[PDB]
Design a protein around this nucleic acid. Structure first.
Ligand code: CA
Ligand code: CA
Ligand code: CA
Length: 676
DNA sequence: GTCTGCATTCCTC
DNA sequence: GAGGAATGCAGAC
């Protein structure tokens, strides 16, 4: 037998890896259960002709945030031991268990989000940091999803990433010798017959089968060079699709990307560099100090890097002296030593970022801007980072005492301090009338950070955490309603730190799905789980569940708000629909009505038998929930004790159905004890 | 209170 | 209208 571990943000992320494996592997025998209270498992027996294989995948939902807050040891430390100095966390880490320790096989990130401008590089930090470790990095992104107007939930123009984003993964792969790739899965809203923007998209770009093949080959310890080349070719084909759809006068053409790809030129020595300039777009509301003046100086000497409006460009060594002179004149820089450092004879990449929102809170997308530059032109390139967003007084005080202290606590400052050779600030200060100008020669500091690795030591995560939280409530709820209770369906599942999944409803042999679910609802709140049961009542049951660590965490009227959220989505035509036999997704045509279903709400939480009959009555009064699911762990022997408390006779019929049908041929129901 | 994970919306060319 | 810039949220530290 071979044992693998799937460390994920939550149970849903872990299960997505299993679903990829299961899509290509047709197992003979499948067993599910728990190895510990927090860790579910899937044990499969499959064959490749005459060759049988026995694998077990132990899932570890919830990564550590500090060092030993959830698990006894952090699996992410194995990445920091190999050079991953950014605390960017992937969605999943797959490990192999050999000689009493774990060994990373790959890191996976799932992104459904709209690739709208800077959202495309928001998570480039994890690709950069994990990519420089030698462990493979796979970025799976849904192509395509539409943006909605929210006023009436109608569709707006499709959003595509800049061609340089998919390309950065290919260039980081070449520079490091590692496998870092962007893979595209067919989204439900990919409807080329209806949208002219997709007329020239090659459907061979989709990588569902190749991602499954790659994972299985890695698990089997086989040569993945061929699969890697197929995946790199699809990433290159996406660069072709995107670059051939943009105006060539301000963006790189496919011929330019191809010449960099085949090794004819490097991105900074392209013979055509300069045909377009770097022209950073700054909103009027973001302007302050001498920022507009600095931007004019950059546009006087810059050459465009990939796109004229990307937040970075190049100042060639031939123009560096004049650019530095102009910056010195603008900001009154007169120190001879500083000027000599700035005038080094090499090409300089200038990156201009706001960095901070009006309240001083850091911009999440900006954390990936320097990693994007480093992935395209190599981390060794000289980077001049200009910041103009508002700083909290505490941040500017740390900049003047120890910039590394600020980088230690904040991820945006960590991105800036790790990859910038020069850090220039022209920032407003919260509580002050005018801007602060700073020029930090960060060259030696950057060099030291690029060679930093944490203590070398083996890691084997103990399957029992420090304590059981909301993620464990979600794992238990997911296991019960998705694997144990029959004729069930998981339309919605949003555990702590989860993706924007969407809601699926099955009715009359069709599956209807709402995508791009907004968090803001006038009368409702998005449920953490929506379970559909069709063989209990004449009308299908939709059970909306909100999970918390404690019963007191259930907000007032949460039960009513969950129902109102479902009613809110029913007021709009589903985004997509498909037949259960056909399987081909189409745009939604017919509307769904709430009275065609029985809507119930439930609150799930951990309680160590501290709730009396009157306490349950008070929770029902506060929340308005139709059902309360009190969960408690028993340590000796390990078991999850479940107590179902119904408010009304409809919920009581559901409870009796769960009790009678708490039996499975796949899931080990022996790990649970249902009190009632 | 702030982390950093998750996003959709705003604004300039 | 194209496409980056700019904005906020949440559970557990
Ligand atoms: Ca995540
Ligand atoms: Ca994700
Ligand atoms: Ca929740």
């Amino acid at each position: 037998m071979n044992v693998f571990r799937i460390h994920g943000d939550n149970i849903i992320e872990c299960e997505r890896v299993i679903d990829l494996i299961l899509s290509k592997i047709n197992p003979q025998k499948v067993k599910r259960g728990f190895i510990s209270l927090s860790c579910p498992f899937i044990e499969i027996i499959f064959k490749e002709g005459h060759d049988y294989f026995h694998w077990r995948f132990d899932m570890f939902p919830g990564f550590n945030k500090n060092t030993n807050d959830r698990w006894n040891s952090n699996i992410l430390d194995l990445l920091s031991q190999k050079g991953s100095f950014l605390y960017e966390t992937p969605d999943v880490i797959i490990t192999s268990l050999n000689n009493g320790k774990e060994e990373i096989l790959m890191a996976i990130e799932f992104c459904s989000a709209l690739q709208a401008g800077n959202q495309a590089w928001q998570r480039s930090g994890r690709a950069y940091s994990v990519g420089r470790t030698g462990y493979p990095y796979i970025y799976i992104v849904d192509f395509v999803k539409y943006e909605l107007n929210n006023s009436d939930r109608s569709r707006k123009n499709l959003r595509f990433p800049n061609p340089a984003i998919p390309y950065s993964y290919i260039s980081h792969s070449k520079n490091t010798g590692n496998f870092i790739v962007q893979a595209y899965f067919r989204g439900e809203e990919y409807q080329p017959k209806y949208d002219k923007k997709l007329k020239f998209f090659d459907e061979t770009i989709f990588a569902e089968d190749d991602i499954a093949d790659y994972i299985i080959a890695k698990l089997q310890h086989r040569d993945t060079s061929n699969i890697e080349q197929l995946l790199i070719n699809k990433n290159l084909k996406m660069v072709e699709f995107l670059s051939k759809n943009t105006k060539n006068d301000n963006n790189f053409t496919y011929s330019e990307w191809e010449s960099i790809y085949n090794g004819t030129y490097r991105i900074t020595n392209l013979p055509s560099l300069g045909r377009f300039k770097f022209r950073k777009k700054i909103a009027e509301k973001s302007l302050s100090g001498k920022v507009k003046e600095f931007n004019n100086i950059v546009q006087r000497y810059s050459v465009g890097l990939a796109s004229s409006d990307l937040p970075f460009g190049v100042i060639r060594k031939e123009s560096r002296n004049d650019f530095i002179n102009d910056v010195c004149k603008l900001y009154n820089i007169n120190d001879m030593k500083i000027i000599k450092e700035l005038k080094e004879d090499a090409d300089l990449i200038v990156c201009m970022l706001k960095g901070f929102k009006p309240r001083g809170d850091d911009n999440r997308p900006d954390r990936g801007a320097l990693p994007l530059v480093a992935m395209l032109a190599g981390e060794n390139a000289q980077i001049f980072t200009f910041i103009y967003g508002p700083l909290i007084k505490g941040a500017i005080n740390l900049i003047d005492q120890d910039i590394n202290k600020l980088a230690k606590r904040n991820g945006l400052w960590k991105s800036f301090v790790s990859l910038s050779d020069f850090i220039v600030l022209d920032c407003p200060i919260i509580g002050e009338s005018y801007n602060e100008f700073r020029l930090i020669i960060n060259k030696n500091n950057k060099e030291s950070i690029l060679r930093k690795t944490s203590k070398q030591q083996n890691i084997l995560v103990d399957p029992t955490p420090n304590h059981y939280q909301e993620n464990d409530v979600d794992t238990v709820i997911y296991s019960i309603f998705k694997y144990i209770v029959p004729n069930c369906f998981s339309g919605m599942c949003n555990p702590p730190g989860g993706d924007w999944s969407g809601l699926s409803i099955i009715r009359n042999g069709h599956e209807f799905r709402w995508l791009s679910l907004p968090r803001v609802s006038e009368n409702g709140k998005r449920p953490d789980h929506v379970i559909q049961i069709l063989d209990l009542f004449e009308k299908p049951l939709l059970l909306s569940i909100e999970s918390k660590e404690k019963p007191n965490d259930l907000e007032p009227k949460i039960g009513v708000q969950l129902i109102k959220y479902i009613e809110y989505l029913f007021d709009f035509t589903p985004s997509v629909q498909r037949k259960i036999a056909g399987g081909n997704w189409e745009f939604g045509n017919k509307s769904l009505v709430p009275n065609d279903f029985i809507l119930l709400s439930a609150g799930a939480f951990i309680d160590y038998d501290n709730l009396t009959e009157n306490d349950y009555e008070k929770i029902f009064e506060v929340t308005g929930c139709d059902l309360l699911i009190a969960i408690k762990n028993q340590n000796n022997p390990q078991k999850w004790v479940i107590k179902f408390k119904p408010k009304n006779t409809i919920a009581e019929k559901l409870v009796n159905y769960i009790k009678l049908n708490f039996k499975s041929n796949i899931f080990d129901t022996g790990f649970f004890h249902i009190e009632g």
